[PDB]
Design a protein around this ligand. Sequence first.
Ligand SMILES: CC(C)(C)C(=O)CSc1ncc2ccc3ccccc3c2n1
Length: 149
Amino acid sequence: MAELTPILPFLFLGNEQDAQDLDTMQRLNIGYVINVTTHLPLYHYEKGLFNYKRLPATDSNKQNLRQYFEEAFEFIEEAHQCGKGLLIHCQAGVSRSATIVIAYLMKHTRMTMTDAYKFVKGKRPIISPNLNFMGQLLEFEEDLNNGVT
Ligand SMILES: CC(C)(C)C(=O)CSc1ncc2ccc3ccccc3c2n1
């Protein structure tokens, strides 16, 4: 049922239904969760098992996700530093969460935007398109190449 896609051995991508499989998350040694929605609950919050961060974003043609990139990168590095996995999820098409993942692959693994997309698309086959998010990833790639971010 639940597919917590490992983009990297410690970085996982999923949707709303994936984020509710508590046993798999604990078996995968996940200790950090990034919820990239305004309206979904922080699943399992009252159990005190994970560190949470909500990026309150919608899946629209006007939503600004670039503003949250640097905040999400620090949370991922914090999980990376202590040997724990991080799950980033949103909803069915994983448009929002896949944008943050690709951006991290561009920033921390030095993948190009295109190669990062093919990397994620190969492991997570169902990704809904968002031209607004594609444009932001393109602007982010140029800023990386110009050493501006
Ligand atoms: C941004 C987000 C991850 C939410 C998506 O929009 C995925 S959907 C899609 N569909 C057709 C494409 C064709 C070329 C391409 C080059 C670079 C990056 C993405 C694409 C591409 N992306």
